[PDB]
Amino acid sequence: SVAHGLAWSYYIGYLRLILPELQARIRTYNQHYNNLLRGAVSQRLYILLPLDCGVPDNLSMADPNIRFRDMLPQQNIDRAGIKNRVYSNSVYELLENGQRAGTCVLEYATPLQTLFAMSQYSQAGFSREDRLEQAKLFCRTLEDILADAPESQNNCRLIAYQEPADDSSFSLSQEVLRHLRQ
Amino acid sequence: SVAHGLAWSYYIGYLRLILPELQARIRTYNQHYNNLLRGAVSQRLYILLPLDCGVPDNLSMADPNIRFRDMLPQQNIDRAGIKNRVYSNSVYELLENGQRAGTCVLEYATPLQTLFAMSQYSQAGFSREDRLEQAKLFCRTLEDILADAPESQNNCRLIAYQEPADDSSFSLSQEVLRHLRQ
Ligand SMILES: Cc1ccc2c(=O)c3cccc(CC(=O)O)c3oc2c1C
């Protein structure tokens, strides 16, 4: 299935690269946050998985209570055939009742952008119902891969969410804070 | 199918990013090769697609007549949700009868590493015959995507190859030189 390929490629071609040294980067970042009240960043990579159509270009614009703060130190990759690539990860503040309630490394899972594009291009043969079915299966498959994987290690957390078509009351910051608070 | 997901994700998540400015990077690189005898780099990204099992960790070690020379100038990416990533591409010399016969940007298609890993991990449910079938379909599917794609533009060339199980006479440098010479 499409989802099975996307889940394995995202693990092999991203998570496996980025997770092993994530903790050390976070540790380095948190040297500037010895005052806990200034908001040290939490330890995990939180991966957002909106099942519904589209993924926002700008994560912080998804929710007024999620605000971009800055970046972790960069990760240089020189293995698995790739030469000198540099990856970045972003740190966001989560607000609740006007005050910072959490700080974390957040990002959308990129293969959802591929599922979205396939649904737009008719040569992909991919209906909207197919897109949703594969998005769901991508999430399940990736969950299962990570349960086994050596590189996590309490390193990564998937946050999948789907909103009712007729309501816009879902709060992404609240959803992430739920995961943070445990 | 697995291949369909891999082909679309490699287009959306790599080729679409790297191809639009490739020409300009090559032009910049070739400022140091105004003497053609020193070997200016050819214009396309040549993507190697070995269908057989495994992809070499080190492209230049695949063939004594392919030698790594150096890198293009880097490509900074800050769009499609990714913040400040830096990509690189490698320039190789191709030799024939002891002398340089071509110079090009070469790399293996990364989703083949994913197909290889899926064949190694039993939770993937993926036999060796499945792996080959999907590798072939990945190549066909990607070919078809690129035929349409706006970002190439005589920018990219796929070089797929499969060797007989009982013979080791295939020369990768000769195969690439064939494509270069047209
Ligand atoms: C911008 C973009 C869009 C889609 C993918 C993708 O499907 C995809 C699937 C597997 C692995 C990757 C690599 C990554 O997320 O760095 C992928 O990257 C994508 C990227 C970077």
Ligand SMILES: Cc1ccc2c(=O)c3cccc(CC(=O)O)c3oc2c1C
């Ligand atoms: C090291 C490695 C391994 C596998 C993939 C991959 O399957 C894959 C599939 C689609 C898109 C990408 C992104 C890329 O090649 O930069 C992919 O990247 C991979 C990388 C970088």
